[PDB]
Symmetry: D2
Subunit: 199 residues, 4 copies
């Protein structure tokens, strides 16, 4: 049942100037930490409700489990999606897949940027893999709703557009934040997630 806050693979200040160290420290050691804590509490509460066949309690716990469970899933992926050695564009089959499904890398960037700017309220923009169709797909998710659990798409790259992800540095200007984050995307990790489901 027991989930843990993952260590960051880099320094809190490693993504500067694109994402400042203070955001990274708050985002990791507080926001994600809170999701992990509450997930462990909720999962424990669910094991009792399940053991006693309390269907009402199982249903009552669903919002907290999706919110905190999704929060843990989403941020865990997010940290691996970023790197001080990031930026540029991918290559190999992923770049080939991107231009097949979206026309171009720059059209892909436009589509995902538009998806992420367009989130009303809190949420996430995702590049996902539709293993059914065998093609890439852009999706947006509200709040902490995780990509795979709610849509079946396999997450490759996630963009957090909760205001806490950018407000201290970029205030309200979400397009400025989205422009900066392209510089820190860990395309090697994105490629690994893509190749992992192409046996």
């Amino acid at each position: 049942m027991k989930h843990s806050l993952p260590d960051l693979p880099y320094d809190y200040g490693a993504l500067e100037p694109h994402i400042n160290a203070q955001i990274m420290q708050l985002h990791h050691s507080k926001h994600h930490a809170a999701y992990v804590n509450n997930l462990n509490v909720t999962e424990e509460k669910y094991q009792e409700a399940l053991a006693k066949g309390d269907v009402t309690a199982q249903i009552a716990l669903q919002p907290a489990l999706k919110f905190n469970g999704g929060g843990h899933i989403n941020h865990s992926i997010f940290w691996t999606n970023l790197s001080p050695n990031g930026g540029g564009e991918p290559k190999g089959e992923l770049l080939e897949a991107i231009k097949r499904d979206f026309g171009s890398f720059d059209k892909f960037k436009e589509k995902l940027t538009a998806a992420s700017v367009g989130v009303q309220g809190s949420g996430w923009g995702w590049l996902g893999f539709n293993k059914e169709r065998g093609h890439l797909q852009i999706a947006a998710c509200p709040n902490q709703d995780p990509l795979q659990g709610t849509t079946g798409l396999i997450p490759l790259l996630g963009i957090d557009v909760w205001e806490h992800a950018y407000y201290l540095q970029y205030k309200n200007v979400r397009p400025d934040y989205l422009k900066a984050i392209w510089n820190v995307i860990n395309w090697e990790n994105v490629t690994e997630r893509y190749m992992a489901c192409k046996k």
Copy 2:
């Protein structure tokens, strides 16, 4: 642990002419039976996912668990809500609480009818008890979303307004079904549920 289809406390034809035996037989014997079976299937797979700490699988199973778990809870209460000896008005504290919160016995029926006719698509109308506030409350819920699990209200009386609850007999005229259902309301059961959560 394992859930069971409750037996009906009366014959399938006991509520005629208000709800005919054919509806009662398919409603209990087919619809509810499916919910119980699928709930038991869903619960087992959730215990596997919880044991492995698979949050994605837990979140993916949430719609099936709420639908079939809620379906089981809602219909379980519904059968006890009805009686061939039903109809008329409640007595004691229940009726007095109804006149306190709704003005009159007959104003409550209008509101509970209005809530249930107003359901767009499939759902339920509920008379519930707000334990925090200590008064009665009308609510509608979509599909099989159970009252207590999603709103915290204690269910006292439920009206099924899924089309399968009336279509064979009343076709599209949902108000005709709601007029007939008052004749079979088991007010003794409603009062018992009300008295149960009053200290």
Copy 3:
């Protein structure tokens, strides 16, 4: 401006034995008629609220407009989707697109059936066209939420899985209804809708 109940292009009994005349008569003559009337009522009140800039009233009217407006759109398409001369397979580009996107003509039916059986509560299964992507796509929509208005997909073929669409004839066994409906699909209409949005 003012919406109208479309006439059926065939007799109420023209789709027997697959869907009997009694369902067709209540579905067109009662259910759809109600949606059109309530849409026209709702539209007028919205024009009043817009004229006064009453945002609260506009937002309060949104559920009734989507339900009745969607109800009108969905059933309007549905009647043209069916024909006594229907059944079999499509021809030309439509069938080739189906085999491109779904593998085979028969794999598509499985998926479209699976999407429509899977609807929890009332709703619709849709074969749609993704103009942006230029490929076919399967989607399900709840209640009367219309395909294009809520997802952007162009509707080609809709399967009504509201219980009133089948319950009188097929009772609870929704798969029996879905097996019968393939015999009356008007593939010429489906192809026309597909060809309409292809430059």
Copy 4:
């Protein structure tokens, strides 16, 4: 159709130290301004769709109209709910109503604080008036969903718990922000809104 950004009845720095001037300036001249701009665009788009009977377009515009329309409604109320002359507790009938419905002012504060901390993602906590029942009621709303348009309750006091409402000053600690805002509540305005619907 034409909505306008209301002038603030006070200086951007008038609520310091409880809400700093920079948050107030960003909140009013950017976040609310954006909602007003997009509301006017959406309403204009809706008048064309309504004039032509384009039901699909009307439904497609509903998310933007509720989001930006609600954003305008919510923030307009919010500004009047705050005052440099605010704080303390209400008196007259409102205080009498609060202790009748919630037991105490301090229990009322606890309930609304808990409702506002509990919002998952972006949203609002509200003290509302149920004119039907004639009693006060606490409600939470997601994103910019406005109270009256979505629940029928009349708004009296709104607490914005979007992260942009507090993050620059209190970072993630929403309980600290909620503690501070009690010092700036304009109870005179809250009382006026309550008395306005008690003829």
